Amino acid sequence: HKNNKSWMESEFRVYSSANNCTFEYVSQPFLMDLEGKQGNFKNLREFVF
Amino acid sequence: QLVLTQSPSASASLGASVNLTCTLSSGHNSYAIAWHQQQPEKGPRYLMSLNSDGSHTKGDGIPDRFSGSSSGAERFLTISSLQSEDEADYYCQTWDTGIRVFGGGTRLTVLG
Amino acid sequence: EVQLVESGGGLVQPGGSLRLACVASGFTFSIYEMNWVRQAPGKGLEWVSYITTSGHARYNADSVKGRFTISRDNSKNSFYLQMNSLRAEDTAIYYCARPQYHYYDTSTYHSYGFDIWGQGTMVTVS
Numbered sequence A: 001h002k003n004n005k006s007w008m009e010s011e012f013r014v015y016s017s018a019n020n021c022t023f024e025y026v027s028q029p030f031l032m033d034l035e036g037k038q039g040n041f042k043n044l045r046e047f048v049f
Numbered sequence B: 001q002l003v004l005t006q007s008p009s010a011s012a013s014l015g016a017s018v019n020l021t022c023t024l025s026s027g028h029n030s031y032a033i034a035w036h037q038q039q040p041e042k043g044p045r046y047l048m049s050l051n052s053d054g055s056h057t058k059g060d061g062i063p064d065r066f067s068g069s070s071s072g073a074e075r076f077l078t079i080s081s082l083q084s085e086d087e088a089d090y091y092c093q094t095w096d097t098g099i100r101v102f103g104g105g106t107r108l109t110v111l112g
Numbered sequence C: 001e002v003q004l005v006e007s008g009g010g011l012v013q014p015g016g017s018l019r020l021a022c023v024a025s026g027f028t029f030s031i032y033e034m035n036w037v038r039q040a041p042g043k044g045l046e047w048v049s050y051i052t053t054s055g056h057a058r059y060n061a062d063s064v065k066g067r068f069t070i071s072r073d074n075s076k077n078s079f080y081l082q083m084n085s086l087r088a089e090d091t092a093i094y095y096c097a098r099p100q101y102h103y104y105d106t107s108t109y110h111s112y113g114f115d116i117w118g119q120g121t122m123v124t125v126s
């Protein structure tokens, strides 16, 4: 927004609405920033499901 | 990536002492930095370098008042007997593998 | 706008316990990682540590002798450095700075360069 300039994820387009909820979980994020080091290295993030 | 950190403002009566300072990361303490005088409504005019040892050099058209230094992982720079013509914006810049980076700005509300 | 204010001054001995605060206002705290700043009398800046948007820290830069510690209260929109042992050299004003690295950034990464410093709090100790 221009007046706030704040960025908020208060958007929902992957899902239209919510319903029938079973589980909720709040924790440390899975993807990791880890950025701050310099050079040409890239953030390769690997996952196993 | 890069931290090229600059003071948004520093205030004192006519006679203060900088010529603005830049902060670097732990991994690249020893790389040299440079700045560009983007004074308001004017384009970038190249004045303001720094090597990691603090050896000073003079630009064109401004007095010898200006100095420099170095300590630890950060980079420190100085003037003696501040004058009026230092109203400007500055831009830290170091060198990487084929990249000009150009850092970020120092829009400075120094009260002169 | 962007503005930062601080609190938590106090005259104590080395080894003491106080609460240093950098109240962050004018922007969303939930996504902005933050820093802390020391300015010894007539001496230059020495940064200590930071807490990222998630809550991780790094107590490097070797001016700290394993002395300063940091934390986060992300919900109340204030940034805290969890402090103990305020010592003699820490007579300083603490202009704390907002990184410009909101966690949604594109283009060349000159992010988290500090575009604004805090109002400052003077903590005289000797």
Ligand SMILES: *[C@@H]1O[C@H](CO)[C@@H](O[C@@H]2O[C@H](CO)[C@@H](O)[C@H](O)[C@H]2NC(C)=O)[C@H](O)[C@H]1NC(C)=O
Pocket (backbone or CB within 6 Å): A001, A002, A003, A004, A005
């Ligand atoms: C400023 O922020 C407020 C909330 O902090 C925004 O409010 C809602 O924003 C959503 C997203 O665009 C809109 O769909 C709603 O209509 C807004 N509601 C209200 C009551 O404002 C607001 O849009 C933001 N606006 C600006 C100009 O920054």
Ligand SMILES: *[C@@H]1O[C@H](CO)[C@@H](O)[C@H](O)[C@H]1NC(C)=O
Pocket (backbone or CB within 6 Å): A019, A020
């Ligand atoms: C899910 O919610 C709907 C409400 O529209 C309900 O009819 C249905 O029985 C619910 N199913 C489960 C498994 O909870």
Ligand SMILES: *[C@@H]1O[C@H](CO)[C@@H](O)[C@H](O)[C@H]1NC(C)=O
Pocket (backbone or CB within 6 Å): B019, B047, B048, B049, B050, B051, B054, B055, B056, B057, B058, B059, B060, B062, B066, B067, B068, B069, B076, B077, B078
């Ligand atoms: C301070 O200003 C002078 C002006 O010419 C500039 O040459 C110098 O590089 C600056 N200081 C340092 C440490 O570079």
